[PDB]
A paper describes a structure:
Inteins (intervening proteins) are protein domains inserted into host proteins that are found in all domains of life. They remove themselves out of their precursor proteins in an autocatalytic process called protein splicing, in which the flanking N‐ and C‐terminal exteins are ligated to form the mature host protein. The more recently discovered and less well‐studied class 3 inteins, by contrast, form an internally branched intermediate in the first step of the pathway. The internal motif C2 : 4 cysteine performs a nucleophilic attack at the N‐scissile bond to give the branched thioester intermediate.
To increase the chances of capturing the intein with active site residues in relevant conformations for splicing we decided to crystallize the precursor and fused the AceL NrdHF fragments with inactivating C124A and N146A mutations. Five native flanking extein residues were included at the N‐ and C‐terminal sides, respectively. Expression of the fused intein domain in E. coli without the inactivating mutations resulted in quantitative splicing with no detectable precursor protein remaining, thus suggesting that the artificial cis‐arrangement did not have an impact on folding and function. We determined the structure of the AceL NrdHF precursor at a resolution of 1.9 Å. The intein adopted the typical HINT fold with the expected localization of the conserved motifs in and around the active site. The asymmetric unit contained two protein chains that form an inter‐chain antiparallel β‐sheet involving residues A12–K15 and come in close proximity at residues E140–G142. Electron density can be observed only for the two N‐ and two C‐terminally flanking residues in chain A as well as two N‐ and three C‐terminal extein residues in chain B, suggesting that extein residues further outside were disordered. All intein residues showed electron density including the three residues (GSH) that were inserted upon fusion of the IntN and IntC fragments. Cys124, in the structure mutated to alanine, was indeed located in the active site at the expected position within the motif C2 motif to allow interactions with both splice junctions and to act as the branch point residue. The distance of the thiol side chain to the carbonyl carbon of the N‐scissile bond would be only 3.0 Å, sufficiently short to trigger the initial N−S acyl transfer without additional larger conformation changes. Our crystal structure shows the M70 side chain centrally located in the hydrophobic core as expected.
Residue numbers in the entry: -1 to 151
The structure:
């Protein structure tokens, strides 16, 4: 429902762990939406759901494959905002959050540089979700790029 495609890697203190393998005992790199600070915290819940539609955001080192009602996290003005994937409308003033290198350096890319595909999948597949106190956490795509994505509330 508010989930990420199976095999999405979640950045933890130890490395980049397949989301379907995350437990409540893992130390996940969260991003606090109120403070913009990075920290490792335990997820308070994990979710497994099977769906057949996906929103694929792709551009400029940003790649997320999410459920329709997954919370997308972006910066606008000086504030960190959320929007459901199916509702997100790119604009020059809304920026997705990339985390570059080993020092957790924030790079903000224009959402208008990110293509959005809404796909009906040929067959159902598993999507997974985490809840963390900061309400967002860092995922790593197939090309080693890290970005901030919404947690389930």
């Amino acid at each position: 429902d508010e989930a990420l495609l199976v095999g999405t890697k979640v950045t933890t203190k130890a490395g980049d762990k397949n989301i379907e393998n995350i437990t409540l005992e893992d130390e996940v790199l969260q991003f606090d939406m109120n403070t913009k600070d990075f920290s490792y915290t335990n997820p308070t819940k994990t979710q497994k759901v099977i769906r057949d539609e996906i929103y694929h955001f792709e551009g400029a080192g940003f790649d997320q494959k999410v459920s329709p009602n997954h919370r997308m996290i972006y910066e606008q003005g000086g504030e960190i905002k959320e929007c459901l994937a199916k509702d997100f409308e790119p604009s020059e003033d809304k920026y997705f959050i990339i985390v570059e290198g080993s020092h957790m350096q924030i790079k903000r890319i224009k959402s208008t540089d990110v293509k959005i595909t809404h796909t009906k999948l040929d067959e159902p597949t598993e999507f997974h979700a985490l809840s963390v106190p900061g309400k967002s956490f860092v995922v790593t795509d197939e090309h080693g790029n890290r970005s901030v994505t919404g947690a389930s509330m």
